Amino acid sequence: IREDTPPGSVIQYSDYELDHSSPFAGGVAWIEGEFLPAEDAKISIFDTGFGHSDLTYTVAHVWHGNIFRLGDHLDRLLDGARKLRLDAGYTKDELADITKQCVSMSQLRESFVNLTVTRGYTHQVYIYAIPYLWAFPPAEQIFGTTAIVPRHVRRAGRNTVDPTIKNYQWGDLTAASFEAKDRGARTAILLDSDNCVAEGPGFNVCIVKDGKLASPSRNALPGITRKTVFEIADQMGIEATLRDVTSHELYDADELMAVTTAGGVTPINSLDGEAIGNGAPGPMTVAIRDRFWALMDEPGPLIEAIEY
Ligand SMILES: Cc1ncc(COP(=O)(O)O)c(C=O)c1O
Known about the structure:
alpha+beta; eight-stranded mixed β-sheet; seven-stranded antiparallel β-sheet; 8 helices; 15 strands; globular; binds pyridoxal-5'-phosphate; transferase; complex; monomeric; Branched-chain amino acid aminotransferase
């Protein structure tokens, strides 16, 4: 339900206890129209979401009992489903109610919330709310992580397995993560076929150079964390641009950061074993990350309180 986070840092879990009398406590899944405890959640092996990975999905997070940008996530999920000729069979409002009920039943104040739409065996909608998941550990959110550029892997292009529609087809992402681990790095930043920056295994990459922020426009998910970071940057008076970022620019960056729903804004201290800047989290990354976590507690349109 919780994990250690750096003391006095912007990231702190809620202080509360689960009611274990409820079978729903700690995880809830909605499958084939029925809410279920997460542990028993199961899907037909014959769903083409398995055999063909014929699906799209989104993930939203809950922090301090508030779900973040659920409407944007549902818009993205439904837009991608339409591009894949998938019919969820539920309206955006209906999905929102079900999702929020999954969180409420789990009792989780911090949660990783998944909505998946699959072609099915009749299209299927699967939803779950489970304890908070970290793409990078809390310590790395605060003190930074390490990356490599794969020698042997590139990101799949938009004309193959399209990264702009969120998907479970991680063959290149998994291969890149193994290469990073083999090389002693925490993660990988993948290039596309033209040696432009694409994205990482589970995150977008933002590049800071000369006081400006850039992020890839082509072979990358249009991330909601990235959208949030760009809004924060705009409010700070920083110019933030979605554009092609060349491999030259990646290696020459003043700061690098990974951004994703599961854990937020992660500084990247080094690339290919070479320090980025001073080898510690950059000033713009720190400013944006701290503002991002403040949004989770501030009343506004980006967050909605779950009713437990
Ligand atoms: C491949 C990939 N790119 C980018 C992201 C970040 O997207 P978002 O900020 O909407 O979670 C994710 C989410 O983990 C992802 O899986």
